[PDB]
Design a protein around this ligand. Sequence first.
Ligand SMILES: [Mg+2]
Ligand SMILES: [Mg+2]
Length: 132
Amino acid sequence: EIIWESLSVDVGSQGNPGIVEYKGVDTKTGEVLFEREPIPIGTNNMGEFLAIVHGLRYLKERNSRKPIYSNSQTAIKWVKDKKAKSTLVRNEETALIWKLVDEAEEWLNTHTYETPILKWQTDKWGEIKADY
RNA sequence: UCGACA
DNA sequence: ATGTCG
Ligand SMILES: [Mg+2]
Ligand SMILES: [Mg+2]
């Protein structure tokens, strides 16, 4: 009951808050389909969220109906809500991540999608394929 | 008072 | 250690 015909996304960091990156992979093959350049300060949950939204945009642009897997219950909720409820402080070091979060929410509020966003069941299936 | 996902 | 929700 793993839907192999899917995109898996995940965050990586150094610190939390700290340097954040994320990527998207083909769940079947492991092939890296997109990878974001490291953002100097952000949170895990912000990155998990940006990964999902990147994935929605990636699949939409390519007319793909594949679902997206994420391991992040937080991010899955933020995407469903179109709203990332982060605590991270706003200052000049966090301005970049907060601009990207704001632009992701804005994309969600201006586009449609029917991509199923699914929880990757780590406890049964091991680490998601996009794990760092 | 936790439980869970990262 | 921290970020987040049920
Ligand atoms: Mg994750
Ligand atoms: Mg991971």
